[PDB]
Amino acid sequence: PAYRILKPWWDVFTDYISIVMLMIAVFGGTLQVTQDKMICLPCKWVTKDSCNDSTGPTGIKYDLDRHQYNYVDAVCYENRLHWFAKYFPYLVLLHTLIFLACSNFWFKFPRTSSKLEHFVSILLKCFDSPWTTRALSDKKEGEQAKALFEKVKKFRTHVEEGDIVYRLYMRQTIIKVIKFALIICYTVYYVHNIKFDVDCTVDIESLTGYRTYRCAHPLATLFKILASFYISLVIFYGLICMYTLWWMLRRSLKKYSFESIREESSYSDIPDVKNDFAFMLHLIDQYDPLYSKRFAVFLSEVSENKLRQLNLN
Amino acid sequence: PAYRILKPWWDVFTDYISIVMLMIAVFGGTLQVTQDKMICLPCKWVTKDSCNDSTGPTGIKYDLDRHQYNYVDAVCYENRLHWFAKYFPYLVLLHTLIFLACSNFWFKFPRTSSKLEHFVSILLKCFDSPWTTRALSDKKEGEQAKALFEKVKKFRTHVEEGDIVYRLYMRQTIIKVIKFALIICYTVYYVHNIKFDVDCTVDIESLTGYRTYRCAHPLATLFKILASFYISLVIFYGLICMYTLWWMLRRSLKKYSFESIREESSYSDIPDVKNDFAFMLHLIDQYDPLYSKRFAVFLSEVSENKLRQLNLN
Amino acid sequence: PAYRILKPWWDVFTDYISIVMLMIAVFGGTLQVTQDKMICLPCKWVTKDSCNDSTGPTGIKYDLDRHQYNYVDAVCYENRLHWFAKYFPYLVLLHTLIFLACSNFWFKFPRTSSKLEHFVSILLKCFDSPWTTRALSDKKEGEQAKALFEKVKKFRTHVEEGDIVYRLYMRQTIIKVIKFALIICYTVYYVHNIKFDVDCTVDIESLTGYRTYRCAHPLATLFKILASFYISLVIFYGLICMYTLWWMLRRSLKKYSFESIREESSYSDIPDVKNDFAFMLHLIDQYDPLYSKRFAVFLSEVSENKLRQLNLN
Amino acid sequence: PAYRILKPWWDVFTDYISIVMLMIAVFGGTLQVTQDKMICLPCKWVTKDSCNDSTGPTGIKYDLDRHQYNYVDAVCYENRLHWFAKYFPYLVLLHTLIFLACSNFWFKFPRTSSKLEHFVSILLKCFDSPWTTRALSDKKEGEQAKALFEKVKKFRTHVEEGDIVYRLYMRQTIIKVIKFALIICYTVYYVHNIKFDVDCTVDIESLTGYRTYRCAHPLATLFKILASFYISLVIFYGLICMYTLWWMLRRSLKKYSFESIREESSYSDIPDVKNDFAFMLHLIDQYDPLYSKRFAVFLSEVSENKLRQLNLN
Amino acid sequence: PAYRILKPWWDVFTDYISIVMLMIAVFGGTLQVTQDKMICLPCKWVTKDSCNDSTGPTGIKYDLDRHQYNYVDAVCYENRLHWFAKYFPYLVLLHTLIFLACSNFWFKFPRTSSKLEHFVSILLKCFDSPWTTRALSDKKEGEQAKALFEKVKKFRTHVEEGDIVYRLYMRQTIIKVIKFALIICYTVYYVHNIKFDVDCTVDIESLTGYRTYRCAHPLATLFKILASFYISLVIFYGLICMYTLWWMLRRSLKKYSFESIREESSYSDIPDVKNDFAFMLHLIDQYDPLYSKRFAVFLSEVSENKLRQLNLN
Amino acid sequence: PAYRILKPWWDVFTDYISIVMLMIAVFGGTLQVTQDKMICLPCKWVTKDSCNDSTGPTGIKYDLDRHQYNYVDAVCYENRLHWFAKYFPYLVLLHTLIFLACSNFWFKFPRTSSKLEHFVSILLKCFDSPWTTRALSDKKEGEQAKALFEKVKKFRTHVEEGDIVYRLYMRQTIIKVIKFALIICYTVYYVHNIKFDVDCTVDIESLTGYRTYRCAHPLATLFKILASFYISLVIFYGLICMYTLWWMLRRSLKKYSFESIREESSYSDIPDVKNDFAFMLHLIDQYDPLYSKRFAVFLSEVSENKLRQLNLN
Ligand SMILES: CCCC[C@@]1(C2CCCC2)Cc2cc(OCCCCCCC(=O)O)c(Cl)c(Cl)c2C1=O
């Protein structure tokens, strides 16, 4: 629904890179389903499995009908063609689905989804209160504010015991970084293996007569373009993931230094949050600090004290 | 709607695995209806009903036009090819539909659908009531709270007599486990029977002249890849099903023990729910214990006393 | 809308069986319009207008180019092939459409659709009314309660004189049963006429030279698979329809015995319903008896009294 | 908008017949675009521009390569095939579009759309008022009641001068019947020009060498099936239209006799609507008579007097 | 939204005609992408750039394989085929997109979209206020009415100074008329230059061996049908546009004649709107005069004085 | 949502040009993947690696089968065909995606998205309140009037510090202008390369026997048409971007003088906005100046004082 408030800028660029990855994966997949044939001809003069390259010119007659051209095309396409040419779109579709599942497992797991839903509910109610204006700058509104005070205190006593959300959000980015590393380790190593002019030697003499054939796989340049684009796009994804991993392993997100807002607002009775709530408060501060600024007045003892004083008067 | 509360975490992994099942099923189906052909050539020298493997090289002339090549391709495609190589996408699509119907029959059945809707409505209303904050730690909401109290008192007697929800959720998982057992029983046995080389001896000499042929089914490798992926993914599905069946036969879900709320909430008078409401309370406890914690205040005669002296005074 | 209460489980299983029959119909139709060809070859030796079946092997030369292969393919495909092999997907799509029309004509015909929507509206309002709590356990709410009383009395005086809903729901299921009988009557008789090998004798000697041909129909096995699947699915559909017809002609749904509820609710002055209102009373009791549970108090004259002296006092 | 209440039952069957017409039109269209081929062979021996039909058998060699077979297929497909075979899907699609435009121009025209919207709004407000039950069987309800009375007296004077809706819905049905007459006049006359066997005598000897050819249009049987289905289905359409035309020129919908409501409601003072409002009230009665019955209270002068008495006391 | 108020009847027929123009455009486009080929044969005997046209008959042998028929087909398709046969669907797609852009630039331009949105909002608020029923024929209603009065006066002071909507609607309709003139000027001139048979002479003897050719373009009849249909449809479009241009240049739409409603409402104090607002009131009068009747009381000085008297008393 | 008010007219024309660009890009892409063919023929009598062009006419025989023709087509399609003839649709799709990203990045970045949405929300709320018209021409209305005064003061204190929105929306246009310069710089330089006639000398005699081939790219004319259309569309896009860049560097949008509204309304105690607030207020003044004028009252301290006087009274 309105879960955009728990997404930083590095989780949106990820969400669009993982969309264009799906785009190129589907495009390569449908193109490989559509054509992906390889045209093969036999060499007459051959030495050490290499073609010898030895009035008016006339055509060379091989004396083959079409159907055993199709057979040798299928055989040399299956056997002597490197597998990375054949199944590259089906690899990258799997990789981008694993990336999407790893990105959205944090939302879809219920043990943290409930906590996130309750958190966004109480922050929406805290943001849509009128009495924070008086707290920062009638009896029914005061008791309504007291009800918000009690439910915010209940949330604070509830969620500050666990570590599951922070642990899950650590374990998502660490395996994203590992997957990026593995992708870069094999894909650029095998990307040279696709090319156009390819030989084959498939040992079928009893069916055609020739021993060695020279083939021409014609989608190779386009597949090379798509693979290079995929390499650059995965590089960008990995730089984003490495940056956010460094940020989260350096900035010590477990506790929130809340004193800076309270010093200027002169509300000294608001302490630091212990764990698993200060992390989400950091993450919404990464959206904007105004939401965390409006949350001080719903956890300050002087603020409940003026609330009950106004209710008594 | 708001039925996502009733679905545990293992019912979401299942619901996404059963989606990618249908994805690979429709992919195999569209590939098979698009091409699924096979190219056959005859062997001139026959030994043991096989191919004997017996100045420049020249082609071998069979003296066959294209159309009887098409005929022998069709005959060797039907008579000498295993049925698992042809109808595997339709088979896995059928099994995917069986799993989906098994998972949603417990919802669309009306006798349990009515009880589930009633249960989720009273949990939403009890979760939205503000009297829980006063009970754990104006008057007109007191009498509507009394109305909710009477509604819960009616519902508790109304659903105590049943067992249908627990029976259906037992039966659905046990037949899902049986379906897993059969699927892994036959698929891994028959998966070896698809291969790129197939020899056919279809006994048509009056139409072509040759007796034995030698073919090349070009999609065998891709179908083997899809089948192995399907087997591993079914293995994940069945591991989840065996885990949830073990949990059901282990934790004794028929009755509920309620003292873990009452001991720390200081409400000495609370009952223990008997059956078919205890199971649903377990099902929402798997989501979170907070909903069961806020449901305790609507079940105590001392809370009835608090409301009665509250709205009298 | 919210007419889904009026559908029992036997009218939801039917609704998915219709969907899956439409799915197999459109799949067979798109496959048949895609290829559905038939490869044909002539036989060089003829006995009883059929193929006689009479150093190394060599091919047989027929001396026919491609175009007069295609001509004889078309001629043998039209003149000497059973019509059930060609128009089976169109036939089953037509049957699925007429089953859907027989399902939804009851809901789209206005002279009963108006009665159904009025009925479901007043049952929703009567079930959601707050006076049922005190009925089963102020003053202006009493005025809306007696407005509900008067509109229920108006509905009872109006719709009881009809018979059209019961008449239509007779005449829909009975013709569904007749159509099942017809489908099972012809389909299992004509299903054995599809096969892979077919011999056409078409008497075209001035265009090719040969007289009798032999043909292969590669789609025969898959069409037989789909046909057997459709036969089994129709048998299950007709079992559902015969069960609901047996129940409906057994229990004699014209009048309701309302005496069961007043035995425990101690409201002896609640009468029986004559006709064409007890029908949907049964039809909503099949959903759940709670809606008829919370409807007795809105038609009884002692409840009229209880509201009347409540407003008086 | 809310125009579903304005459509009688004879415009419900029409709206689905017009959908199945469009679906068979688009099926024929995709057929005729996708393949719609013709296969042609020459006759060596001719007798008055007709084929004379004159050890082992051998083929007949025509000495024609494939591309001048394609040429003679093109020329014999255009010059010697009837136009009803080629453009029948486009004809039926055009007629379906004209039927839809004819049946919805009555709604899309603004000069009557405004009147229909105002009419359905005031009947919704007449149906929503609780004062009707009080009139048939405390002061603010009288205020909105008298507002509704005054706006009904405004509407009745506003819409009584026109004659536009009745005239347009004359013209709609009468041109629908006329188009029925034309369709059945020409389609069953031209349906016999589609046939599997077609003979062309084009006399292009300078490019092939032969004079006459004997062709085979392969989709003729399926096109004949579709055409016969279309004829029967548009016959059903025309019988529906003729029935509603006869109904509308029999029942004399210009004026509304309205005695049947006042005789059972005891309201001796009510008038008869003159024109152009009587027809629409007949139409909503044809939906159901309840809305026409409930409209008597907002026009009777004694009802106005009772409302004025309740507003004064 | 509900912006159908601001579109007259001549701007809805225009919209539907634009939709069917785009439909035939995309149909012709996908047809021309899918096949659009042409079959060409050489003429063995030539006289003045034309074919000389000179036991049993035998075929003519050209000794040309299929691929150099494909070459001559491509060459004679590019050079000696008229371009209007080639790019007519793309031309008509461009024309219908230009027509849609011209029809919606008036709405999407914000400098007029603001005025249209404010005008339609004010007219709807004037329609929905219940004080109009009192005005044409207790203090909160008067305050709401006087707030509406002052905002109507401020809106009148606002929009009377500009003149941009009328001028943009001028510049819209006049370019629509000029574009129609251009389309009809060139399309009927070039429509005669598509035909089935066409003679090409491309001077390639070093590759094929012949000089001139005879060709056949199989889509010519369908393209001519679509072109004639488009010309008739564009004629209808231009008749509609010239009619509305004549009406709008004849009625002098800048200033309103508001006397004919004040003389029957007996509100003698009402001013005539000068420009750019009276044109909008003319446009709403083209929908219905009821909105003009209800808008009279929200500008009358005696209506303001009656409201002041009601507020004071 | 409500961001359409806050987008000038030069971001709607751009937003439609950048969907026409995507439409022609996807059309070119699907055409190129569908056909991707070019027909090549060998030249016998050659000079300087070019085709020298050195009873009745007869065809020229090359003694080549079809599969060698396919091979030489593939080779001359890869090597001697320019890359701009092949990857132009993918290039223009990439440029379209870059333009769309530069269009929507200023929305999707959260650090400015928060400011933009908060600004548009408070503008909508200030436009919604009726007290503005009273100020520019019941104490509870003053209470939320003072609440909106306070939160507008908080907004003015908050957003006026930074410059990020102005910096981003300047950077986006300057890089769009740079991208325009690059595209126009290279596309018109490379557009001359595509043509129907292309020669190739690929040095493969061991496989065919010939050395030079003359070819024909049958889609070069349509690709040239699409390229010229794209160049014109790019030119119009760049003119729009040059206009908005000149507008930015000419109006000096950093501060906003507020003199006109205070001069016409005699509210002399109004301030001048410093930065990052004047920019967005300019950008909605481009929509209409009335939204800026209705915000004048809420910044006015004499309006604050007169509200204080009304609250005192
Ligand atoms: C007039 C003399 C005929 C002799 C010929 C030789 C070929 C080897 C032995 C003789 C030439 C030829 C061309 C054909 O079309 C071109 C090759 C296949 C493309 C079909 C398109 C598709 O892929 O659908 C076909 Cl089909 C045949 Cl059968 C034959 C022959 O028979």
Residue numbers in the entry:
A (entry chain C), B (entry chain D), C (entry chain E), D (entry chain F), E (entry chain A), F (entry chain B): 15 to 68, 92 to 174, 233 to 408
Describing publication, verbatim:
SWELL1 or LRRC8a (leucine-rich repeat-containing protein 8a) encodes a transmembrane protein first described in 2003 as the site of a balanced translocation in an immunodeficient child with agammaglobulinemia and absent B-cells.
As anticipated, SN-403, SN-406, and SN-407 had increased ICl,SWELL inhibitory activity compared to SN-401, with SN-406 and SN-407 having IC50 of 3.1 and 1.6 μM, respectively, and SN-401 IC50 = 3.9 μM. Overexpressing a SWELL1 mutant in WT HEK cells wherein the endogenous SWELL1 R103 is replaced with an electronegative E103 (R103E-SWELL1) functioned as a partial dominant negative for ICl,SWELL current, reducing ICl,SWELL 84%. This residual current in R103E-SWELL1 expressing cells is less sensitive to both SN-401 and SN-407 inhibition, as demonstrated by a rightward shift in the IC50 of SN-401 from 3.9 to 6.0 μM, and SN-407 from 1.6 to 4.2 μM. In initial maps using sixfold symmetry, SN-407 density was less apparent than for DCPIB/SN-40131, potentially due to a reduction in SN-407 occupancy that is a consequence of lower compound solubility or the presence of multiple drug poses in different particles. Pose 1 shows the drug oriented vertically in the channel’s selectivity filter in a manner that is similar to that observed for DCPIB/SN-401, but with the lengthened carboxylate chain coiling to maintain its interaction with R103. In Pose-2, SN-407 is tilted off the SWELL1 central axis, positioning its cyclopentyl group closer to the hydrophobic cleft between SWELL1 subunits. These data confirm lengthening the carboxylate chain in SN-407 preserves electrostatic interactions with R103 and enables additional contacts between the carboxylate chain and upper hydrophobic moieties in distinct binding poses, consistent with the results of our docking simulations. However, collectively, these molecular docking, cryo-EM, and functional experiments indicate that SN-401 and SWELL1-active congeners (SN-403/406/407) bind to SWELL1-LRRC8 hexamers at both R103 (via carboxylate end) and at the interface between adjacent LRRC8 monomers (via hydrophobic end), to potentially stabilize the closed state of the channel, and thereby inhibit ICl,SWELL activity. Indeed, SN-401/SN-407 cryo-EM data and molecular docking simulations likely reflect the closed state of the SWELL1 homomer.
